[PDB]
Amino acid sequence: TVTNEFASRFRTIVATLANVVNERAVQDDMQKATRSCTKQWLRHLETQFD
Amino acid sequence: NIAVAHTDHLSVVYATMSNFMLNFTNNFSGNHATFKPDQYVITSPEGSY
Amino acid sequence: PVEYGIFIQRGATYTINAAGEFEFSGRNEKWDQSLYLSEHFPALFSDVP
C-alpha cells in the first residue's frame, strides 16, 4: 500500500555508502571541510529519489 | 574599576537570563578539558535523520 | 621550540576510551570546526600532566 521496496533498496545503499565516506581518515583540513558538507548532498539526493 | 560593575550588576542580568522561557539547553562551560554538547537528532524508520 | 616538539609529539587531539582515561592520537592534525559537534578535543586543553 505504501512500501515501495525499490526506493527502500536505494535507501540501504545510501546508508552503507555513507560509512565509507564517514570513515576515510584524511588530513590537512580541506577534506574535513568537504567531508561534512557531502552529507548535505548524500542525504538530499536520497529524498529526491523517494 | 570594571571589577565593581562586572560583579554586582552584570551578574544580575545573567541570573535572570537562565530563568527565561525558550531557553532549554545546557551550555555548561566550566572545565573545557571535558565538555561536549548533546546531539538530539529527529530519527525516522525510513529515510534520513 | 625545544619542548614544543615534545608536546605535539604525543598528539594534537585525543578521544576518551569507554570508561577510563584519555587516548592521545600520535598524529599531528590542524584543528577544524567540523570536529566540534562530533568527536575529539583540542589536546592543548586536555589537562593530563
Q: How far apart are CA C8 and CA C24, in angstroms?
A: 10
Question: What does the DSSP 8-state code read for residue A29?
Answer: S
In 3D space, the residue among B4, B26, B44 whose CA is nearest the CA of residue A11 turns out to be B44
User: Which residues from chain C sit within 8 angstroms of residue B34, using beta carbons?
Assistant: 16, 41
DSSP β-ladder status, C13-16 and C41-42? antiparallel
Question: What does the DSSP 8-state code read for residue C33?
Answer: G
The technique is cryo-EM
CA distances (Å), A40 to each of A18, A36, A37, B37, in order? 11, 8, 6, 22
Place of cell 562551560: B29
The data reach a resolution, in angstroms, of 4.1
Put the strands of the sheet holding C41-42 in their side by side order. Answer: C22-24, C13-16, C41-42
**What are the DSSP calls for chain C, one per residue?**
-TTHHHHHHH-SEEEE-SSSSEEE-S------GGGTTSS-EETTS----
Strand partners, C42: C13
CB contact under 8 A, B34 and C41: yes
Cell numbers describing residue B22: 525558550
CB contact under 8 A, A36 and C30: no
